[PDB]
Chain A
Amino acid sequence: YHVEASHTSRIIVPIKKIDYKKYNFENTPIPRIYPGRQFIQSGLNEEQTIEMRQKF
């Protein structure tokens, strides 16, 4: 797909939906790339933390 200078060009790229039965995003801790820091409870209720983990 050609794109000239300073001109947006919408691009399509289909995806197969991810099946929830084999990915368990509800309960999967977020990775930390520099482990070994004191754990500080930021504070998020169960609903918000599940939403955040799913989105990430």
Chain B
Amino acid sequence: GYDYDYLFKIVLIGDSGVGKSNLLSRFTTDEFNIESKSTIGVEFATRTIEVENKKIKAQIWDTAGQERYRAITSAYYRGAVGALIVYDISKSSSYENCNHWLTELRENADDNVAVGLIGNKSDLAHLRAVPTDEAKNFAMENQMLFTETSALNSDNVDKAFRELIVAIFQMVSKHQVDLGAPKGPTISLTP
């Protein structure tokens, strides 16, 4: 089923323990091999979507590095075209690492890469360790989309994901246009 016209690589990069494993578990085409995060550094999700008649395949790579993965974790961003910075609104420590995460992303990955920023587990209203106002202000200063997500607050991550892909498409879509025979006997006029 090789009907998709384009294939966009996007990294679900984020801090350890953030619940990103549960984040991408909702929106999935979950089949085939799983639990490959510890095998090398990554686990894979995919989806085909329709964007004005141009089918687009996505590749969510969920990079993770605990203590030993130093070089290959950076090398996995050789040609990444999207990023999905995952943080959690439960502790300031997770949000503090976003600056370093973006610095590494911009340094290594493709120049002018689309970056979104998702706040997992917003249902918990007891330990809101960072305000949405400050998060939005941080989002302003880099031209990068922002959203917060929860199990009960569904469809937000899905619409943000689709809008991220259609935003990337406008950047890396070169315009493509959809580009009476003589029937009868013949006589040779060659000399």
Contact = CB atoms under 8 A, between A and B. Distances in A.
B132 interface: yes
Interface stretch (B32-40, B123-131, B167-175): B123-131
A41 interface: yes
Interface of B: 125-133
Contacts of A38: 128, 131-133
Interface in A26-40: 38-40
A55 B74 CA distance: 52
Q: Is the interface of B mostly helix, strand, loop or mixed?
A: loop
Nearest to A41: B127
A40 B128 CA distance: 5
Interface in A17-56: 38-41
B162 to A, nearest CB: 27
B150 to A, nearest CB: 15
Interface residues of A, number: 4
A40 B132 contact: no
A44 B128 CA distance: 14
Contacts of A41: 126-129
A26 B130 CA distance: 28
Shortest Cβ-Cβ A-B pairs, 8 listed? A41-B127, A38-B131, A40-B128, A40-B131, A39-B128, A41-B128, A38-B132, A41-B129
Given A38-B132, A40-B131, A41-B126, 4 more contacts: A38-B131, A39-B125, A40-B128, A41-B127
Contacts of B127: 41
A33 to B, nearest CB: 19
A49 to B, nearest CB: 14
B63 to A, nearest CB: 30
Nearest to A38: B131
A16 to B, nearest CB: 40
Nearest to B132: A38
A39 B124 CA distance: 11
A40 B130 CA distance: 7
Nearest to B131: A38
A41 B127 CA distance: 5
Nearest to A37: B131
B125 to A, nearest CB: 7
Contacts of A40: 128-131
A41 B91 CA distance: 10
Contacts of B129: 40-41
